Amino acid sequence: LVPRGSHMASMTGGQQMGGSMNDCLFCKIVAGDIPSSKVYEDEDVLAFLDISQATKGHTLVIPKEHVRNALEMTQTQAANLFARIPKIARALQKATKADGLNIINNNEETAGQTVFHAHVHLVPRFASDEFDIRFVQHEPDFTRLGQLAEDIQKEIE
Amino acid sequence: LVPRGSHMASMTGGQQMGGSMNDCLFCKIVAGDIPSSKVYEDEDVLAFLDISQATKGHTLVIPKEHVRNALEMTQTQAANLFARIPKIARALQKATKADGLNIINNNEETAGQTVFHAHVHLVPRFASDEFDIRFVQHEPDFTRLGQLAEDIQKEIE
Ligand code: NA
Ligand code: NA
Ligand code: NA
Ligand code: NA
Ligand SMILES: [Zn+2]
Ligand SMILES: [Zn+2]
C-alpha cells in the first residue's frame, strides 16, 4: 500500500482539505484561474470537455472540492459527484447523437491517472471510434475464485 | 435516439419497475435464484466477482433495484449506487495489493454493454495486465470545441 501520514490525513485515504490543493490544474479551473470548455456547473460539481477529445463530446466531471480519486473518497463525496452524472450523460448523448457511453474513473498511475484531482470521464460512443476498452476474459477456477471473494469480504468487514 | 414509449415509462429513460425485470440474470442474482461470488451486500447494492476476471479481483457492483444503465438513472439511483463504491474499491485494492483501479460503467451495446442491468466494474490494476483502456488523443480546434460545449450546455438547460 501507498504511504500515509500527514497533519491533514483523511480517514478514507489521502488528505482532507485544510481551500484548494496547490499545483492542481483542476483546482485552478474550479477557481476560475484557468479557462475550461464548460458544459455544466453547480455548487458541488464542474463538467467540461476534455481537450484531447478521445471521442466527440468526451467530458470530464469533477468535484469542486479537491479529492485525489475515488479510492480516497468518502461515501458523501462519491454520492455527490455521481448524482449529477446521469443528467450530464443524457445531455451529452442527445447533443452528439451518440449510440452509447462509457463512464470511467481512473485511480493512480497504473490505471492511467495523471492529474490527481478526481475526474469521471463521459466518453460518447458511435457505431467508428478509435477509442476502446480491452476487456480480456479468463475461465475461472471456482475454488480460487471463492477464496478470493472470501479474502475481499474480510477486508470490507 | 432510442425509442421510448411504455405503460411503465420512466421520466429519465427506460422503464420504472412495476418487483424485478424478467429475463434479467442480475435480478435473478439479487433474488438469490442464481449464485454469485459475493464480496459485499447491503439494502441497496450487491457486489460480486466478475467470473471472467478481466484482472485479478475484477468486481461488478450492481443496484438491487433494476435499472438499465446510468443513462437511465435518476440522481437518487446514481447517488445510492456509487456511494458504496469507494469503500468496496479500497477493500479490493487491499485484498489484491493492486497498484491502481479503474471504475467503469458501460451504457448500451456500442459501449460494450451486454447485460441490461446497470453494473459498475471495479478493475484492479497491477504494475502486468492484459487489460487496457485505449485513450486516443487529438488536437482541438478551439472554435469547434467551443461550439460543441455550447450545444451540450443547451441540452442540459
Ligand atoms: Na479521503
Ligand atoms: Na483519468
Ligand atoms: Na429511468
Ligand atoms: Na459492462
Ligand atoms: Zn484539485
Ligand atoms: Zn435486473
Side-chain angles (χ1 to χ4, degrees), chain A residues 2-10 12-42 44-127 129-133 135-143 145-149 151-153 155-156, chain B residues 2-10 12-42 44-127 129-133 135-143 145-149 151-153 155-156:
Chain A
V2 116
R4 305 266 296 268
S6 181
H7 73 121
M8 288 298 349
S10 171
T12 52
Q15 298 167 235
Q16 303 172 37
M17 304 302 316
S20 88
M21 193 61 81
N22 275 32
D23 289 348
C24 182
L25 173 69
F26 289 4
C27 276
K28 292 174 187 186
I29 289 168
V30 173
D33 295 342
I34 298 190
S36 66
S37 307
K38 286 188 201 183
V39 298
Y40 177 82
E41 179 168 9
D42 63 31
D44 293 342
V45 152
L46 174 69
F48 47 85
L49 299 172
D50 190 301
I51 261 72
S52 71
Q53 289 295 92
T55 61
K56 182 190 169 180
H58 173 19
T59 289
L60 299 186
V61 184
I62 69 173
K64 288 190 168 180
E65 175 187 65
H66 177 99
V67 60
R68 183 178 172 93
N69 57 30
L71 285 174
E72 304 185 349
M73 276 174 201
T74 69
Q75 54 181 50
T76 293
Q77 286 171 324
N80 274 338
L81 179 55
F82 282 92
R84 332 306 222 245
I85 280 177
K87 160 196 174 168
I88 300 168
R90 280 187 289 271
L92 196 56
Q93 175 178 45
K94 287 191 303 283
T96 57
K97 301 179 189 189
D99 304 299
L101 190 120
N102 303 95
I103 292 172
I104 301 170
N105 178 69
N106 291 342
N107 300 262
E108 305 304 326
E109 189 188 353
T110 59
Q113 194 172 19
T114 76
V115 177
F116 291 89
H117 181 128
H119 42 287
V120 183
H121 295 255
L122 307 183
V123 181
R125 299 297 300 277
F126 305 89
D129 297 319
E130 300 258 30
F131 183 84
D132 190 40
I133 307 182
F135 271 105
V136 301
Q137 289 180 60
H138 306 88
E139 288 290 351
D141 175 323
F142 288 112
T143 299
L145 190 77
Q147 182 60 53
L148 177 51
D151 291 352
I152 292 161
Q153 265 193 7
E155 298 302 332
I156 279 80
Chain B
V2 116
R4 305 266 296 268
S6 181
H7 73 121
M8 288 298 349
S10 171
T12 52
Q15 298 167 235
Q16 303 172 37
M17 304 302 316
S20 88
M21 193 61 81
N22 275 32
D23 289 348
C24 182
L25 173 69
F26 289 4
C27 276
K28 292 174 187 186
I29 289 168
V30 173
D33 295 342
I34 298 190
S36 66
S37 307
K38 286 188 201 183
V39 298
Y40 177 82
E41 179 168 9
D42 63 31
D44 293 342
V45 152
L46 174 69
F48 47 85
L49 299 172
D50 190 301
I51 261 72
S52 71
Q53 289 295 92
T55 61
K56 182 190 169 180
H58 173 19
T59 289
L60 299 186
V61 184
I62 69 173
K64 288 190 168 180
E65 175 187 65
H66 177 99
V67 60
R68 183 178 172 93
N69 57 30
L71 285 174
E72 304 185 349
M73 276 174 201
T74 69
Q75 54 181 50
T76 293
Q77 286 171 324
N80 274 338
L81 179 55
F82 282 92
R84 332 306 222 245
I85 280 177
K87 160 196 174 168
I88 300 168
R90 280 187 289 271
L92 196 56
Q93 175 178 45
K94 287 191 303 283
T96 57
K97 301 179 189 189
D99 304 299
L101 190 120
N102 303 95
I103 292 172
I104 301 170
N105 178 69
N106 291 342
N107 300 262
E108 305 304 326
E109 189 188 353
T110 59
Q113 194 172 19
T114 76
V115 177
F116 291 89
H117 181 128
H119 42 287
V120 183
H121 295 255
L122 307 183
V123 181
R125 299 297 300 277
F126 305 89
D129 297 319
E130 300 258 30
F131 183 84
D132 190 40
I133 307 182
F135 271 105
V136 301
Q137 289 180 60
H138 306 88
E139 288 290 351
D141 175 323
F142 288 112
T143 299
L145 190 77
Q147 182 60 53
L148 177 51
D151 291 352
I152 292 161
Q153 265 193 7
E155 298 302 332
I156 279 80

